[PDB]
Structures are given as C-alpha cells and as structure tokens.
A paper describes a structure:
The Ras proteins are master regulators of cell proliferation and survival that transduce growth stimuli emanating from cell-surface receptors to cytoplasmic kinases responsible for orchestrating a comprehensive cell division program. Ras proteins are cytosolic, membrane-bound GTPases that bind guanine nucleotides and are regulated by their nucleotide state: guanosine triphosphate (GTP)–bound Ras adopts a conformation that binds Ras effector proteins with high affinity, leading to their activation and downstream signaling, whereas guanosine diphosphate (GDP)–bound Ras adopts a conformation that cannot bind effectors and thus is inactive. Here, we report our initial findings on an alternative approach, one that exploits directed evolution to discover miniproteins having extraordinarily high affinity for the most functionally relevant surface of Ras, the effector domain. High-resolution crystal structures demonstrate that the miniproteins bind Ras as a dimer and interact via a distinct binding mode that captures the Ras effector domain in an open conformational state, which can be stabilized by insertion of a proline at Asp-38 in Ras.
To test this, we recombinantly expressed the 225-1 Y7C miniprotein (which we named 225-11) in Escherichia coli and found that it spontaneously formed a disulfide-bonded dimer that bound Ras more strongly relative to the same miniprotein reduced with 2 mm dithiothreitol (DTT). Taken together, these data support the hypothesis that the 225 miniproteins bind KRas as a dimer that can be covalently stabilized by a disulfide bond between the two cysteines at position 7. The non-disulfide–linked 225-1 and 225-3 miniproteins failed to afford diffraction-quality crystals with KRas, but the disulfide-linked 225-11 miniprotein afforded a crystal that enabled us to determine the structure of the KRas/225-11 complex to 2.1 Å. This structure revealed a disulfide-dimerized 225-11 miniprotein bound to KRas in an extended, open conformational state in which the switch I loop and β-strand 2 of the effector domain are peeled away from KRas by the invading miniprotein dimer, exposing one face of the bound GppNHp nucleotide. The dramatic disengagement of the switch I loop appears to be a more open version of the previously noted “state 1” conformation of Ras and that resembles the effect of the Ras guanine nucleotide exchange factor Son of Sevenless (SOS) upon binding Ras. The KRas-miniprotein contacts occur primarily through the α-helix of one miniprotein protomer (“primary protomer”) and β-strands 1–3 and switch II of KRas. Key miniprotein-Ras contacts appear to include miniprotein residues Glu-15, His-18, Glu-19, Trp-21, Trp-25, Asn-26, and Tyr-29 of the primary miniprotein protomer along with His-18 and Trp-21 from the “secondary” miniprotein protomer. The miniprotein dimer itself appears to be stabilized by the disulfide bond and by hydrophobic packing at the interface between protomers.
Numbering used by the authors:
A (entry chain B): 4 to 32
B (entry chain A): 2 to 166
C (entry chain C): 2 to 32
The structure:
C-alpha cells in the first residue's frame, strides 16, 4: 500500500504516487 | 504527453520482470526497504519525450468491475506470453478479447510479447508468434527480462502503436 | 479544479479507489 504523497507534493510527485496506487488497487481485488 | 500502458498475460510469463527491467534496469532481486517501487518513467521515443505509467497486472484472473476500470484507463496493452509455455501463448486470444470487451472497441493499440527468449526450453517458435500477430495486425517483439533484450523495444513499439490511434 | 486529499490509515479500498479516480481527474484537469 503506497504512502500518501504529502501536501508539499509536486504534480510529478502525485503522478508517481498515482501510478503506484493504480497497481496496488488492481493487485488487491 | 502521458501514456498509460498495461501489461497482461498468464501467470509467471514475466510481466513484473519486464516492468522491473524497463524502470529499474536489473533482473536479479535487489533488497531496498527504504524505497517504494516505481511504475513511471520518462523516455524519448522517435525524438519526442513521454511519460509512461505501467499497470503491471496480476496473472491471477477474476471478475472485478474496479479491475475493468483500471484496465479501461490503459491506452495500449502488452500481451505477454513466455516462449516456454504453450498455454500462455494460447491464452493470448482470451487476453485480446478481454481488452476489446473492457475498451468497447476492436481498435485498441496492442503489442505481442514473447518473453524468456534466453531460456533453453523453447516450446513456441518465432514464426508461429509472428503469424498470430499478423493475424491481429499488431507488432510482435521477442524479449528476455533476464538479458534485457527487446525490453525497450516492446514498450516503445506499443507507444508507437498508440501514436497511430 | 480541487486537489483531492489522500485518505488515512483506516480507509477502505473503495475510499482509495475514490481518491484514485479523483486524482486522475485533478491531474488531467491541471495538464
Ligand atoms: N530466464 C528468465 N526468467 C524470467 C524472465 N522473465 C521472468 N522470469 C522469471 O519467471 C518467474 C516469474 O516472473 P514474474 O515477473 O513474476 O512473472 P509475472 O508474469 O509477474 N508473474 P504473476 O503472473 O504471477 O504476477 C520468475 O522466476 C522470474 O525470475 C526472462 O526473461 N528469462
Ligand atoms: Ca479477488
Ligand atoms: Ca537500478
Ligand atoms: Ca472479484
Ligand atoms: Mg507479477
């Protein structure tokens, strides 16, 4: 489960997080 | 431009190892509990930069509306079989049909990948895979996540297929 | 376009799903 990205997070930080969340949510179905 | 890439195929064909070669440039396990593993990569393909997000799907298949939605977000799909696993190769039709279903279109950017080509135990022949791919009007690339052969080319060639949609 | 808030330790997979979808919308709106 990926750590939340934080309030200082750049747009690029959020894309990186998103791609991780994508894989995580798929994997645990 | 962003590209959402989805890697699919039967259990153990090497989906994760391919993704791991693309993003991290190694095949042997590394140990690093400090870092989360990444599914995003910046690359230049044919003189244009892009950002790639890779959905590296579980081999274990099931019904799931949320999984369908995760796959629907994909713009192009690598359909991966392993050259030593005839069943993984026969499964590709089913994976193509599932992508067509989820996407609600017959025209979905796709590439056929025959992985584990370094192995001594080939059971599926290049010519055979070329013909399936030609039958589908999609490219075919053979790869080894072990040696890295074809790995770039597989994902980059998919990007090329998206650019023609 | 509003930046969605990542949910806490306790949240459901459906709550993560919701964030996933909202975060895609936000990242699409802002690019
Ligand atoms: N020799 C060789 N082995 C490979 C190659 N790619 C993957 N493997 C091996 O095959 C096994 C499965 O690899 P893995 O990447 O987990 O495949 P997967 O499709 O993600 N598995 P799953 O479907 O279970 O999620 C592992 O032992 C891995 O090291 C390759 O190109 N060559
Ligand atoms: Ca399940
Ligand atoms: Ca590395
Ligand atoms: Ca289910
Ligand atoms: Mg895997």
């Amino acid at each position: 489960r990926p750590r939340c990205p934080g309030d200082d997070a750049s747009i690029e930080d959020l894309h990186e997080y998103w791609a991780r969340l994508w894989n995580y949510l798929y994997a645990v179905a | 431009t962003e590209y959402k890439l989805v890697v699919v195929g039967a259990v153990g064909v090497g989906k994760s190892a391919l993704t791991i070669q693309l993003i991290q440039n190694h095949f042997v396990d590394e140990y690093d509990p400090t870092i989360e593993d990444s599914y995003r990569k910046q690359v230049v393909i044919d003189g244009e930069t892009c950002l790639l997000d890779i959905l590296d799907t579980a081999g274990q298949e099931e019904y799931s509306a949320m999984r369908d939605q995760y796959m629907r977000t994909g713009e192009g799909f690598l359909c991966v079989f392993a050259i030593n696993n005839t069943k993984s190769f026969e499964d590709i039709h089913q994976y193509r049909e599932q992508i067509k279903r989820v996407k609600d279109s017959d025209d979905v950017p796709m590439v056929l990948v025959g992985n584990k080509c370094d192995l001594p135990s080939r059971t599926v022949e290049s010519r055979q895979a070329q013909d399936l791919a030609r039958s589908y009007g999609i490219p075919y690339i053979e790869t080894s996540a072990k040696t890295r052969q074809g790995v770039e080319d597989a994902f980059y060639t998919l990007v090329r297929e998206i650019r023609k949609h």
